[PDB]
């Protein structure tokens, strides 16, 4: 949100998607559960001994979404 | 035309990033994925900004769809509810949620303008009223209101479906069948989509906005319900081939000091 | 323990032994995540039973040996 | 150690399984009483356990702390 800080129609638009990359940021600053995805099912191995599958991903799936958002907006 | 919309609504992924890649990405862990379509116009790219939002989860959502949705762009604003068939109750509860998610979306943020309300439930009326006729007596359908489609994945594994647990056509047609009964209630559609198979999503989204889809009930595994293809009949001759009539109960079928004193007395 | 005259180690500065009043010696290690003693001697029949007065060493590198005198009669290189 | 685990319950989590090993032999010496064959046994139980049960509650200290 930081960095996000008749031709002059292009405004209205970018506008939008500026003002929608800030929502998810609302979420009690923590949130506690920021990760959508599993692992598969383990039978002899150390699967709960390490972190989680989405664990090690969600940052950069969040921090890529925005990304997104960002680059779908001129064209 | 306008500014058109898309409301794409992933239920945990459910192959909604391969839905947009064999339609027209980074990955998805929140949701609120703003994205353009370059749809032909029947002529050229005639610049049909049809922006569509990836939402996945229930993680703070209700921000992200109040600025997904400005005020005139209610009537243009096609809600896609998606839910892959490999969890067929996932898809059954996750429709009813995804209508309840947009009755919030209606009664919080549609609720302001007033002339938009007169104007947009009458619309509504209309729109569910043209959603049935020229195809070639009344459902019973719920207050919900804006371009509402479903969109089902996981359709091309009814074989896997079948060798793991339904092995029968009462699984199968259950889920047609109640999938029929939310569309019906809804004032809806239904559009399954395949790996690699199905190209027919974008027939009724640029057809309803302003290539026009079929219907299939003879495959039984690539089944679409265009709009208009959802009669609360239909629901109960489909759940009735070896299948209970109406059930309510086969949802869920388908579905120091401590050890010192501890050993005091061992001591004797 | 009570270490009694914990001297040198030759050629192993940092690796410091003494011996003790329980009967028992302990090598020390202060680059071994331990200043505790990372090579205690048990009090068995081998150790020493009473107390041992004079640890020393005995000889370099190649013959290593620690003489731990005790006050049993009984010492051990 | 016993007091490193009671003091700091964060410790004693990991510590119990070992801690009820040395436990149990120190029950076994709780329960006899001049048991001049079973002595020195229980004494090389205890005291080896004791060993190995220091360095256990030590290294766990360290390791949970990093």
């Given at each position: 949100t930081q960095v996000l800080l008749x031709x002059x129609x292009x405004x209205x638009x970018x506008x939008x998607x500026x003002x929608x990359x800030x929502x998810x940021x609302x979420x009690x600053x923590x949130x506690x559960x920021x990760x959508x995805x599993x692992x598969x099912x383990x039978x002899x191995x150390x699967x709960x001994x390490x972190x989680x599958x989405x664990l090690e991903e969600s940052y950069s799936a969040v921090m890529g979404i925005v990304s997104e958002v960002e680059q779908y907006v001129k064209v | 035309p306008s500014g058109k919309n898309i409301l794409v609504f992933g239920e945990d992924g459910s192959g909604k990033t391969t839905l947009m890649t064999k339609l027209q990405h980074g990955k998805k862990?929140?949701?609120?994925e703003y994205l353009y379509l370059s749809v032909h116009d029947e002529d050229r790219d005639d610049h049909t900004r049809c922006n569509v939002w990836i939402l996945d989860g229930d993680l703070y959502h209700k921000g992200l769809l109040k600025f997904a949705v400005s005020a005139e762009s209610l009537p243009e604003t096609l809600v896609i509810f998606v839910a892959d068939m490999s969890r067929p109750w996932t898809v059954m509860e996750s429709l009813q949620k995804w209508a309840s998610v947009l009755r919030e979306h209606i009664d919080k943020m549609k609720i302001p303008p007033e002339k938009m309300r007169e104007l947009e439930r009458k619309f509504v009326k209309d729109f569910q009223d043209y959603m049935e006729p020229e195809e070639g007596d009344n459902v019973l359908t719920h207050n919900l209101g804006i371009p509402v489609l479903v969109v089902c994945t996981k359709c091309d594994a009814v074989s896997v479906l079948e060798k793991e647990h339904?092995?029968?056509?009462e699984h199968l047609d259950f889920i047609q069948s109640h999938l029929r009964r939310f569309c019906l209630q809804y004032g809806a559609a239904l559009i399954y989509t395949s790996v690699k198979e199905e190209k027919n999503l974008d027939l009724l989204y640029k057809y309803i906005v302003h290539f026009t889809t079929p219907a299939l009930v003879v495959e039984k595994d690539a089944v679409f319900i265009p709009a208009?293809?959802?009669?609360?009949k239909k629901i109960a001759i489909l759940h009735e081939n070896f299948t209970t009539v109406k059930p309510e109960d086969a949802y869920e079928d388908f579905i120091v000091f401590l050890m010192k004193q501890q050993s005091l007395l061992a001591k004797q | 323990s009570a270490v009694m005259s914990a001297t040198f180690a030759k050629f192993h500065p940092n690796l410091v032994v003494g011996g003790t009043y329980s009967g028992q010696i302990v090598l020390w290690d202060?680059?071994?995540?331990?200043?505790?003693?990372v090579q205690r001697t048990p009090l068995?029949?081998?150790?020493?039973?009473?107390?041992?007065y004079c640890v020393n060493v005995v000889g370099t590198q190649n013959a290593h040996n620690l003489i731990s005198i005790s006050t049993d009669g009984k010492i051990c290189s | 150690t016993c007091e490193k685990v009671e003091e700091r319950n964060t410790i004693s989590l990991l510590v119990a399984g070992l801690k009820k090993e040395v436990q149990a032999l120190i029950a076994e010496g709780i329960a006899l009483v001049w048991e001049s064959y079973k002595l020195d046994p229980y004494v090389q139980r205890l005291a080896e356990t004791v060993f190995n049960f220091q360095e256990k509650v030590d290294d766990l200290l360290i390791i949970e702390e990093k």
């Open positions: - | 862990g929140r949701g609120l339904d092995y029968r056509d208009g293809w959802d009669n609360e | 202060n680059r071994s995540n331990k200043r505790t003693p068995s029949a081998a150790a020493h039973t009473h107390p041992v | -």
